[PDB]
Amino acid sequence: SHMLEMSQERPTFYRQELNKTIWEVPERYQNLSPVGSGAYGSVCAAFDTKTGLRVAVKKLSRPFQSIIHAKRTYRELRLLKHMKHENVIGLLDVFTPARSLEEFNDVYLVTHLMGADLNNIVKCQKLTDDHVQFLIYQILRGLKYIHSADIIHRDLKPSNLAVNEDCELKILDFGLATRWYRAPEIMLNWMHYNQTVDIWSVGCIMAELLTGRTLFPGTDHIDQLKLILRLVGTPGAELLKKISSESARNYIQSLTQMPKMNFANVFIGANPLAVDLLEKMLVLDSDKRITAAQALAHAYFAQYHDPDDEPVADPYDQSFESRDLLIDEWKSLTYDEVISFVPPPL
Ligand SMILES: Nc1ccccc1Nc1ccc2c(c1)CCc1ccccc1C2=O
Numbered sequence: 177s178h179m180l181e182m183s184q185e186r187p188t189f190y191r192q193e194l195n196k197t198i199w200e201v202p203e204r205y206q207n208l209s210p211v212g213s214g215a216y217g218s219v220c221a222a223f224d225t226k227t228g229l230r231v232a233v234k235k236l237s238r239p240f241q242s243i244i245h246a247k248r249t250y251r252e253l254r255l256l257k258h259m260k261h262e263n264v265i266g267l268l269d270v271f272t273p274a275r276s277l278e279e280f281n282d283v284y285l286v287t288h289l290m291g292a293d294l295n296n297i298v299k300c301q302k303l304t305d306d307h308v309q310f311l312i313y314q315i316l317r318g319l320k321y322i323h324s325a326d327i328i329h330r331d332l333k334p335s336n337l338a339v340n341e342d343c344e345l346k347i348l349d350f351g352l353a354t355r356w357y358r359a360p361e362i363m364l365n366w367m368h369y370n371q372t373v374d375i376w377s378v379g380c381i382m383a384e385l386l387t388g389r390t391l392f393p394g395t396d397h398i399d400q401l402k403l404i405l406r407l408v409g410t411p412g413a414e415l416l417k418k419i420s421s422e423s424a425r426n427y428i429q430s431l432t433q434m435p436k437m438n439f440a441n442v443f444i445g446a447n448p449l450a451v452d453l454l455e456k457m458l459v460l461d462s463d464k465r466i467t468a469a470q471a472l473a474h475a476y477f478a479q480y481h482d483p484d485d486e487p488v489a490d491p492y493d494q495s496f497e498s499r500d501l502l503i504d505e506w507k508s509l510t511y512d513e514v515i516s517f518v519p520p521p522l
Pocket residue numbers: 211212216219232233234265285286287288289290291292293338348349
């Protein structure tokens with residue numbers, strides 16, 4: 177009760193070659209092998225002998241290359257240390273082989289191994305309506321939590337969604353096939369947007385899960401916008417009066433005017449509740465777009481929705497974002513976050 181530890185032992189590390197480079201990790205982690213071949217950024221699957229589960233270990237080897245990199249490393253670590261939710265990738269461990277700040281260079285992050293991203297899942301099977309309900313439900317459950325912490329993903333897409341063989345899903349890699357899921361207001365920066373940029377992305381993902389194909393496969397920014405307007409219709413005058421960029425307003429007004437298409441004619445053979453939900457997600461007016469919390473209560477998710485089991489996050493203090501610091505200062509803050517990490521219970 178009042179007994180304290182007067183010291184602590186560093187784990188024993190070992191070295192090995194993986195992806196043509198040396199990985200140095202605690203002996204806790206065994207049988208490492210690369211996954212994704214660079215797609216997700218130096219990630220190895222491993223067996224965690226402590227928790228007795230398969231883990232994914234991600235190595236950051238250039239985290240402090242510049243001020244921009246160092247601040248991003250700090251941001252990502254603070255975010256990941258904060259996220260504690262079934263549908264958001266969080267941290268089982270974070271470590272460095274360094275024995276002091278002086279020898280600090282590499283950061284390794286450890287999370288539960290999922291085994292695929294949603295892209296791989298879509299390629300390997302046609303998902304049933306039940307799969308789609310469950311996958312989208314989990315994305316929205318994760319987003320409710322993330323948004324409640326005043327965090328926006330900003331780049332939600334199938335490759336940022338980890339899925340396991342039990343159809344469980346977690347959201348990976350917060351932002352800030354690359355443009356197809358992006359909200360229009362952030363594609364051509366109309367305005368200081370809101371959290372529902374992520375809901376637009378969910379709508380695009382859900383559509384693809386239902387049809388088996390990309391909803392708006394644009395070849396560039398302008399083409400992408402044209403594909404969007406063809407479905408949702410050209411925005412009215414008042415929707416224009418709300419966006420700030422004069423360049424944007426001018427261009428879209430030169431385009432041929434189009435009415436909102438009938439969504440039932442696009443998402444054929446889909447559950448009518450699914451279609452109705454898509455109509456609430458895929459709207460241009462971000463002040464009218466459904467929220468994650470509102471979407472969770474939509475009848476489409478009647479089988480999964482449980483208001484008592486859709487938790488929100490603790491407030492997330494981002495005051496560090498307003499600081500302008502040197503590489504060594506961001507690096508020191510990051511080191512502090514590494515050594516102060518408290519692992520989840522067993
Ligand atoms: N974001 C973060 C933070 C800490 C540690 C790791 C990660 N990033 C991860 C974690 C797990 C997985 C993937 C990326 C990529 C998708 C994928 C594809 C293929 C096989 C497995 C997995 C998968 O489980």
